Amino acid sequence: PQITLWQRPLVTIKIGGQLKEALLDTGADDTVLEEMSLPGRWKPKMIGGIGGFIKVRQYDQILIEICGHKAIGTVLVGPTPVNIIGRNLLTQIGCTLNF
Amino acid sequence: PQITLWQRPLVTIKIGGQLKEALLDTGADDTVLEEMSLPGRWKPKMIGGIGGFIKVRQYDQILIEICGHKAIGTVLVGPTPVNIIGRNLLTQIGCTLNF
Numbered sequence: 243p244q245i246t247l248w249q250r251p252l253v254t255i256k257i258g259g260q261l262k263e264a265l266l267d268t269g270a271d272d273t274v275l276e277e278m279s280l281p282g283r284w285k286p287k288m289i290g291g292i293g294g295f296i297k298v299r300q301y302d303q304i305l306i307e308i309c310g311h312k313a314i315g316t317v318l319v320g321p322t323p324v325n326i327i328g329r330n331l332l333t334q335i336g337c338t339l340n341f
Numbered sequence: 342p343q344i345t346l347w348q349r350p351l352v353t354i355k356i357g358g359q360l361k362e363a364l365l366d367t368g369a370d371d372t373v374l375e376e377m378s379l380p381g382r383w384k385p386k387m388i389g390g391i392g393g394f395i396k397v398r399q400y401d402q403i404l405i406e407i408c409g410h411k412a413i414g415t416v417l418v419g420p421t422p423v424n425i426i427g428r429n430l431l432t433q434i435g436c437t438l439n440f
C-alpha cells in the first residue's frame with residue numbers, strides 16, 4: 243500500500259509469535275525493538291541516536307512479518323522508546339519513498 | 342522521484358541560503374538540523390530519541406527547499422548527529438511510503 247505521512251507510519255508486525263506495532267522508519271539503518279521475549283543466541287552491540295547511545299542485543303536471521311510480508315534479518319533488541327522497522331528490513335518488503 | 346532504501350535516503354536542501362544534506366526520515370515527527378546559522382527568534386524545546394533527550398532551538402515558519410520542492414515549517418536546531426527532514430516537512434513535498 244501507499245502510506246502518507248500526516249500520521250506516524252505504524253504497522254502491525256508478527257515476530258516471535260507475538261504481535262507488536264512498529265514504525266516504518268527510513269532514518270533507521272537497522273530494525274530495533276523494545277525489550278521482548280526472543281528465542282536463541284545474540285551478540286552485544288551499541289547503536290547511537292538523537293540523545294546518545296543504547297546497548298542492544300543483536301539477533302541475526304530473525305523472521306519478522308511486517309504488514310503481512312515476510313522478511314528475515316537482523317533485529318536489535320533493547321531500550322528503544324519505540325519499535326522501529328529499519329532499512330535492513332524495509333528493502334525486503336519492497337518499501338520505497340516517493341515524492 | 343522514487344527512492345529505494347538500500348542506501349540512506351539523503352537529499353540536498355537549501356535553508357538559510359546554505360546548502361546541506363539531510364536524511365528523509367519517516368521516523369521523525371519534526372525536522373531537526375545540526376547546529377547552523379539561522380536568522381531570527383526561536384523558542385527552547387527538548388525532543389527525545391534513541392539514547393535520551395537533546396535541547397534544541399525551535400524556529401517556526403522556516404523556508405526549506407528539499408530536493409527542489411519548497412516547504413515552510415518548524416525547524417529544530419541542535420546537537421542531532423545527522424540533519425533529518427521529518428514528517429512536518431515530508432507531507433509538504435508530497436512524500437509517501439510505498440510497499
Ligand SMILES: CN/C(C)=C1\C(=O)Nc2ccc(S(=O)(=O)N(CC(C)C)C[C@@H](O)[C@H](Cc3ccccc3)NC(=O)O[C@H]3CO[C@H]4OCC[C@H]43)cc21
Binds near residue numbers: 272
Ligand atoms: C548505526 N546505525 C544506526 C545509527 C541505527 C540503526 O542501525 N538502527 C537504528 C534505529 C533507530 C535509530 S534512531 O532512533 O536513533 N534514528 C536515527 C535518526 C536519529 C537518524 C531513527 C529516527 O527515525 C528516530 C526514531 C525514533 C522515534 C521515536 C523515538 C525515538 C526514536 N527518530 C527520531 O529520533 O525522531 C525525533 C525527531 O522528531 C521526533 O519524532 C519522534 C522522536 C523525535 C538509529 C539506528
